[PDB]
């Protein structure tokens, strides 16, 4: 059975997360936690928490024991971006677009 | 009576993008470039519905020439013999006969040669 997990409004741009997301696509869950652990990005921590959350979902709510599971989709989509203001020079102003992302991890032991 | 053009304007844009499918990049996603691409495509289609004939006829004249020179006569002399012999076979067929049934094309050569002689 496929179990999904989401982290919406994650404080990281989708472009940065996709680099980590393409790293773990199609790999075993046990391997996936190892790579994410020894990956020096904060965005790696966010995806690792969602992956770990998905494992707990597959294990408790839905059925599935352990090992056999493996990640099949890890698409990360954009999220609503707050628009702050940063004063520049000579009066000019800029629209700092602090962006966010939606991390989704779908794992199926198939 | 205030009219909102949203529905009809959307229909016009969507109709244009349907003929722009398969075009590279923004030509199949953005209305301004797609509109120019579809209209430009229509210009090409109008011009080439005549160019098709031209290129086709060209290709044929080439296959008939190769078969005729394989039989020992040039295209210009070969056509003259058929005209002298009151033969009205067309070029498209002659090329098809030259490739698919060579014996009949060879038979044609003697008649053209005899009329020339």
């Amino acid at each position: 059975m496929e179990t999904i997990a989401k982290h919406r409004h994650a404080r990281s741009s989708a472009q940065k997360v996709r680099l980590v997301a393409d790293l773990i696509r199609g790999k075993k869950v046990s391997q996936a936690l190892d790579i994410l652990t020894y990956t020096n990005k904060k965005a790696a921590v966010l995806v690792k928490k969602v992956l770990e959350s998905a494992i707990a979902n597959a294990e408790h709510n839905d059925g599935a024991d352990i090992d056999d599971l493996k990640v099949t989709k890890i698409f990360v989509d954009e999220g609503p971006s707050m628009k702050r203001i940063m004063p520049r020079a000579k009066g000019r102003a800029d629209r700092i677009l602090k962006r966010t992302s939606h991390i989704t991890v779908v794992v199926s032991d198939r | 009576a205030r009219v909102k053009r949203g529905v009809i304007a959307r229909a016009r844009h969507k109709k244009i993008l349907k003929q722009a499918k398969g075009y590279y990049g923004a030509r199949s996603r953005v209305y301004r470039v797609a509109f120019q691409a579809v209209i430009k495509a229509g210009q090409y289609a109008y011009r080439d519905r005549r160019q098709r004939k031209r290129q086709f006829r060209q290709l044929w004249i080439a296959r008939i020439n190769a078969a005729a020179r394989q039989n020992g006569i040039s295209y210009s002399k070969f056509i003259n013999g058929l005209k002298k012999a009151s033969v009205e076979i067309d070029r498209k067929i002659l090329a098809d006969i030259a490739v698919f049934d060579k014996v009949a094309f060879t038979a044609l050569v003697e008649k053209a040669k005899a009329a020339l002689a």
Partner: protein, 103 residues
């Protein structure tokens, strides 16, 4: 075997049992049409190159259907000259099936 005949200002090379598309004929869909203007009859190795129109040429065909071909859009547009023109066209055709070639 196969034969070559001219029907609508164009020539076609057809064989027995083939279905060939021609320009529209003013014949009802269920009917038999005779083409007496046969140009060339080939029987596999012996031909009868009509000079012109083989004398003993008879093409027997059965009308199958009448219809319109695929739509073609005509687009005329002269850039920068505030001129544009679009037009559609569907050409009528008649489909006939060749039932007999007799010399």
């Amino acid at each position: 075997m196969y034969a070559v005949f001219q029907s609508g200002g164009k020539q076609h090379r057809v064989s027995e049992g083939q279905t060939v598309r021609l320009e529209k004929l003013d014949i009802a869909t269920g009917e038999t049409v005779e083409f007496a203007e046969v140009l060339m009859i080939a029987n596999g190795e012996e031909v009868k190159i009509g000079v012109p129109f083989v004398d003993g040429g008879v093409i027997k065909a059965e009308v199958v259907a009448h219809g319109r071909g695929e739509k073609v859009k005509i687009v005329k547009f002269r850039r920068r000259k505030h001129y544009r023109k679009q037009q559609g066209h569907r050409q009528w055709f008649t489909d006939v099936k060749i039932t007999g070639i007799s010399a």
